[PDB]
Amino acid sequence: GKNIQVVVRCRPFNLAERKASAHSIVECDPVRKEVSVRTGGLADKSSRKTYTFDMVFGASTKQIDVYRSVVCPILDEVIMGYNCTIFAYGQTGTGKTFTMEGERSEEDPLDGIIPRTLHQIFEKLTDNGTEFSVKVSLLEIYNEELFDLLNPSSDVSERLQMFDDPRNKRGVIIKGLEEITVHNKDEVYQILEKGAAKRTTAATLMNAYSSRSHSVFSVTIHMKETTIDGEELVKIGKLNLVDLAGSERAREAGNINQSLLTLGRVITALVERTPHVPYRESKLTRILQDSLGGRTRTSIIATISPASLNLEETLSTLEYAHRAKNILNKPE
């Protein structure tokens, strides 16, 4: 019960889990906001471990219903001119990218957050008369090094440098980052497309895999609203959509442990109001600082597998989400 929402989304079985003879160990109960996992080793059908969250989504949960519960309330905040962040956390293949982006293959029912938010920003702002402009940026953090995914020319190993700008505190300046003007609703798709192809090339040429790196898609809205006898009103607002690296050579994995672990140290600090927030201690936390501790709405989506095969990773991601906002199991 705070500005920090921690929720869990369990995916359906994949084909590999079915080929492996995996069994369902995850039980999701949306009404009690609980998730339990049968933890039993040999001959133990007794032990189950429960966790309670702000929200629990089962495997049959639709995209649009994750959007309506988690994203709408954050968008309103943004439209009022605030900075907010939504994180997808979890094991590779549990649906981080699916939640954040989705796919096409009205509103395409497989759409994730990113295309859906754009469509609403446009629908809402154009309905209520607001004067506005929409900018998006997409970068990637691999090995504590930033890479612009949207820069049309300059396709290379080219890193971006980050400076702590004297101008504003809490903030940071990334020199050279492409910010693209979004001219209309459906334009997200080709922008996601361009970022994709580039992402692919950085996978093959630098072996930087999207499963090993943080993906930050930023949208900024400039709004001007006026009403007769209504006070002309000027607002900027910012929405950060972060698709994290997998939570599951030796050097760079040590690094991804450090960031997620720091991001978590940060979220725990925000929840507790316990001062001294260690934004400093990783690039990711640094890039996002202005949208985090400065009071705001913040959300974490934790993804999980239903299968016995994934039990260790599933428990870790729930141990993690739970260390982030500790909320107690309730009786009965």
Ligand X SMILES: Nc1ncnc2c1ncn2[C@@H]1O[C@H](COP(=O)(O)OP(=O)(O)O)[C@@H](O)[C@H]1O
| 93 assigned binding-site residue | yes
Question: Which token pair is 176?
Answer: 């050279």
From candidates 9, 11, 33, 96, binder to Mg ion by CB under 5 A: 96
Least Å distance, CB 159 to a second copy, is 10
97 or 151: CB nearest Mg ion: 97
Least Å distance, CB 96 to Mg ion, is 5
Question: Which token pair is 20?
Answer: 């492996």
| 96 assigned binding-site residue | yes
Does 65 participate in binding ligand X (rule CB under 6 A)?
no
| 5 assigned binding-site residue | no
Spatial contact of 300 and 321, defined as CB atoms under 8 Å apart: yes
Q: Phi, psi (5° rounding) for residue 190?
A: -75, -25
Binding-site partner at residue 89 among a second copy, Mg ion, ligand X, none, CB < 5 to 8 Å by type = none
CA–CA distance, 164 with 167 (Å, rounded to integer): 9
Tell how many helices (H) and how many strands (E) occur in the chain: 9, 14
**Total residues at interface with ligand X (CB under 6 A):** 15
Beta strand extents in 39-163 (DSSP E only): 48-52, 55-57, 83-90, 131-141, 146-148, 162-163
Question: Which token pair is 109?
Answer: 């029912």
CA–CA distance, 51 with 172 (Å, rounded to integer): 36
Spatial contact of 47 and 38, defined as CB atoms under 8 Å apart: yes
Spatial contact of 210 and 55, defined as CB atoms under 8 Å apart: no
Binding-site partner at residue 303 among a second copy, Mg ion, ligand X, none, CB < 5 to 8 Å by type = ligand X
Does 99 participate in binding Mg ion (rule CB under 5 A)?
no
Does 93 participate in binding ligand X (rule CB under 6 A)?
yes
| 92 assigned binding-site residue | yes
Among residue numbers 100 through 119, which ones bind ligand X (CB under 6 A)? 103
Please tell me whether residue 299 adopts helix, strand or coil conformation: strand
Spatial contact of 253 and 260, defined as CB atoms under 8 Å apart: no
Region binding ligand X by CB under 6 A among candidate stretches 12-20, 26-34, 38-46, 168-176: 12-20
From candidates 33, 96, 214, 283, binder to ligand X by CB under 6 A: 96
Q: Binding residues for a second copy, per CB under 8 A?
A: 14-16, 19-23, 38-45, 92-93, 142-143, 145, 157, 200, 203-211, 249, 308-309
- Binding-site residues from annotation for ATP: 90-97
Binding site for ligand X (CB under 6 A): 11-12, 19-20, 90, 92-98, 103, 211, 303
